[PDB]
Symmetry: D3
Subunit: 121 residues, 6 copies
């Protein structure tokens, strides 16, 4: 499912304030990460990244590709491909606890200025 | 070279049933893999993926990046970027024989059901 | 920041002939590389690619992800996400000098021949 | 810092029985891992493995090489090169919890049976 | 097991002349690859190399670490840590077939001359 | 060639003080990286490391394995496998120039102090 900026904004309300990051920072980050596509999937030779936040199967979730993954989010990666972002949000909180919002390079690279444009009326 | 659901459907007829996988499954998988673009190419720091099936150059084919690739499909990777999908299919059959359809994670994740929407009637 | 074939053609003028490569080849390559988007950023498990030319943080530039980067172009990777392609071109000349145009597989695979459609007149 | 087959038994006591793995298995596994050298360090192009258990800087601990490591064990990797194996063991227990003893391929491979030679 | 140069020269007799490479070249190559240790194993974040020839689990054999390995040699990697080098040899031929002796960089760099010192 | 501490100490004189690192530090680091084996070669899936200093074919030199290496030292990797440490040092200087001594993780943790055992009163 390809969401609209305002839709992402709404759906991510649960992440508001987590780790102190605001929604415009989240909307901007996910835009540069998956272009707002909940079904985004990229398979490389060693790993595959899943969904809206492009979570990878080497550390966060379990795959057919990496069954020996640390699976920090204790979930099967494909659960990140459907339309209910509940699972994504749960795992993302785990990532923020372990590495921080800057785990995503796009946050600092493209989301530290002109933040008002990522806002929703 | 961008294709549509039914052109992919028509051109992958030879994979139909091969190894026990159905056509809608393939149409679905290639969609989530390359969005039906025969010239899709993704270069990473140490591996690059080619064509409609995004075949990588570490194992299946050879290119200047990984000259020591196992090159199981015995072909130069750029043959996967033309519009003739014959070379591609030969290789895919080799991948299926060795690893199976779920070698493509998108298949297991998004193309193992509800395939009805990947259908093209009259073939 | 999505350019058009001809804007790219215009902006990369300083690369013309460099390393013996013609502009139509440059236009073709960046099209297959970033789709002409000066802000393309692809983050993988341990490397991230930046901008029009998708320059990576393991060798050419400095990231928060790879601080021990050889950083051949002596620059922080995010300078490749702005609209000013000056940084990018300076770095691309470096890459050309060190490895060559075929460092980009898209060039060899698709942009060394049948260049007519990449012409901009 | 080189331990002998017997010191290892002593030092890894806290691991005994944890995750179902016995000491002789650990003695065997760590032998194939680091030769009982607690300062063992293998640096590759992208990853680096530290200490007796050869814990990597990509997932388990934080490095200068990999500052964005998920750092699951919440610790700086060089604390695995000291002679206090307390922090090592604590991290190993997390790996066991999250992945299991077979995360170490040498275990399943060479330290599954004939565990007699690994006694002290 | 830790073979000697002579023990290796004997057990790799089957590779004699395959793909055109001589026994000394093979002895030299394995020397620089594993020091003749048939139980040599090196696990990294993404792959693991096994045995005398340090065969990796991403392409040649089936692992717990890499179950989607193309498994070209249709064999589980642990079989490369046995003292019986028959499997190792079967797989090495496949590698010579798909890639060539120079798949091992040590061969081209160190085992292409001054070979008489690898004779037995 | 398997050298002794002092043979290595001797051969790396040009590196004395380069980038601020003393010989005792180098003699310690190279022992931890290659065991003083000038012919050490470690081949992995994606890269290989060569010689005394274990320089890789991903960034510093050119290989048949990685022909598209950035090849910063502008040298073919196997030149790092012989007895003459001259190219090795030339390249180590470039690495020190680009990334620094702590490019070698063993240095920081094991070869920064308590170096009595690594001196040579030659």
């Amino acid at each position: 499912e390809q969401l609209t900026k305002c839709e992402v904004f709404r759906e991510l309300k649960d992440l508001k304030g987590y780790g102190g990051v605001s929604l415009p920072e989240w909307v901007c980050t996910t835009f540069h990460t998956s272009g707002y596509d909940t079904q985004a999937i990229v398979q490389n030779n060693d790993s595959t990244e899943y969904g809206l936040f492009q979570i990878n199967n080497k550390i966060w979730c379990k795959d057919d590709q990496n069954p020996h993954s640390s699976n920090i989010c204790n979930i099967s990666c494909d659960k990140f491909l459907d339309d209910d972002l509940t699972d994504d949000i749960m795992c993302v909180k785990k990532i923020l606890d372990k590495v921080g919002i800057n785990y995503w390079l796009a946050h600092k690279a493209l989301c530290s200025e002109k933040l008002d444009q990522w806002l929703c009326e």
